[PDB]
Design a protein around this nucleic acid. Structure first.
Ligand SMILES: [Mn+2]
Ligand SMILES: [Mn+2]
Ligand SMILES: [Mn+2]
Length: 430
DNA sequence: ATTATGACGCT
DNA sequence: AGCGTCATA
């Protein structure tokens, strides 16, 4: 009774950009605006690989990881923007810099956790308490929530979609008790008001639109965010969880999209998140381990405790390139040339990072893939990173991998390399 | 022959 | 440490 924890202590939001790289290119090139559009890397192999798709183009069935030539079969008028190439490789700097624009705006409202190049979590608990004390028991007007959906509403005793959003919002606000400054539903609502303000600032100041989710933890906020994309935000209350989860495939929850989620389904013979509630914590721990078991037990009830980490900057800076099919590197001079190309991009990004962020990387990780190996990475080795010098870094990288060559004579490289990776890690203040 | 990343868990 | 898992454009 009075003692069951309900995972309602925090207000957490996740803000995620809409079709992010496409918006970055559409801002730069107005001819791409309001069009079926995609962003592609490379060109020669099957038109290049698509990595971002406008919502107009999704309507034709265009997706990420589609070759452009195949996307064009679905959408003949599809417009394309190409990722920059520098030093023989795709260079993502434009999108990393656009990301910083957005992250710096979000940071004006709260400490954020950068979770990808286009999204961040926000713990709004404190900001909500202050807006509530300002409010002075003042009801929250629907006009303060112009792009908010309330998940699960409307319900009970118009065929438009905006009409439905407003009906749900009205039912939600009508049920609220604004008299209680400790009420979780009220706290989420005020959180949503703040996130409207945040999203308006992002669009005003960058031209980019985004979606958001507001809930009591990161997993629910992430799930919420996707429910009404694009250019909308969604509030998932604690009370909405049993209905939401009763038909929610397990794989849709963050961390459960891979082998663990598949094992949950197979071992327990279930399909939906809600079905997990019928197992004891010990049962779940027995199948999935102590940590996963406790996490699942709480998660299926809408409860999760992972903190929003105060980290706005990536903690690693890496450069990677695949060499697929017949382009695999087979000579020493080839390997050394590409290690240098990667190291030069790495130096450029590291030197900028040092100036911007007052830190220095201290470890260099070198990774390669060899032909035949299914695994992402075949080998991973570290060495010291003592100077931001591309020639030193590439020479050092070569030194750490040079023994991988099964060749008898030194000039050939075998088995051929299908991936090179350089990553700077272990930052210290400077 | 999607690729280019980036965080965190295990032992 | 090195490997594996899961994730995002
Ligand atoms: Mn996005
Ligand atoms: Mn995202
Ligand atoms: Mn995506």
């Amino acid at each position: 009774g009075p003692h069951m924890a309900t995972g309602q202590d925090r207000v957490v939001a996740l803000v995620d950009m809409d079709c992010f790289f496409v918006q970055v290119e559409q801002r730069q090139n107005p001819h791409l605006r309001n069009k079926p559009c995609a962003v592609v890397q490379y060109k020669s192999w099957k038109g290049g690989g698509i990595i971002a798709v406008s919502y107009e183009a999704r309507a034709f069935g265009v997706t990420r990881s589609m070759w452009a030539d195949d996307a064009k079969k679905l959408c003949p008028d599809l417009l394309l923007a190409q990722v920059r190439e520098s030093r023989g490789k795709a260079n993502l700097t434009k999108y990393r810099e656009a990301s910083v624009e957005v992250m710096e705006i979000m940071s004006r409202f709260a400490v954020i956790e950068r979770a990808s190049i286009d999204e961040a979590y926000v713990d709004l608990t404190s900001a909500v308490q202050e807006r509530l004390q300002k409010l002075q028991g003042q009801p929250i007007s629907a006009d303060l929530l112009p792009s908010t959906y309330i998940e699960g509403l409307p319900q009970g005793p118009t065929v438009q979609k905006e009409g439905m959003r407003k009906q749900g919002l009205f039912q939600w606000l009508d049920s609220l008790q604004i008299d209680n400054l400790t009420s979780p539903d009220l706290q989420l609502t005020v959180g949503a008001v703040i996130v409207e303000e945040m999203r308006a600032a992002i669009e005003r100041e960058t031209g980019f639109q985004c979606s958001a989710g507001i809930s009591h933890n990161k997993v629910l906020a992430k799930l919420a965010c996707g429910l009404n994309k694009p250019n909308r935000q969604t509030l998932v209350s604690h009370g909405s969880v049993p209905q939401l989860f009763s038909q929610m495939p397990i794989r849709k929850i963050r961390s459960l999209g891979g082998k663990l989620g598949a094992s949950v389904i197979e071992i327990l013979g279930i399909e939906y998140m809600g079905e997990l509630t019928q197992f004891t914590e010990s049962q779940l721990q027995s199948h999935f381990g102590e940590k996963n078991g406790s996490w699942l037990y709480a998660m299926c009830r809408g409860i999760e405790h992972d903190p929003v980490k105060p980290r706005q900057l990536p903690k690693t800076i890496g450069c990677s390139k695949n060499f697929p099919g017949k382009t695999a590197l087979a000579t020493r001079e080839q390997v050394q040339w590409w290690l240098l190309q990667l190291a030069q991009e790495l130096e450029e990004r590291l030197t900028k990072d040092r100036n911007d962020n007052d830190r220095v990387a201290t470890q260099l990780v070198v990774s390669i893939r060899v032909q035949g190996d299914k695994r992402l990475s075949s080998l991973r080795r570290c060495c010291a990173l003592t100077r931001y010098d591309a020639h030193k870094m590439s020479h050092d990288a070569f030194t750490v991998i040079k023994n991988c060559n099964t060749s008898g004579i030194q000039t050939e490289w075998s088995p051929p390399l299908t991936m090179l990776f350089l990553c700077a890690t272990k930052f210290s203040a400077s």
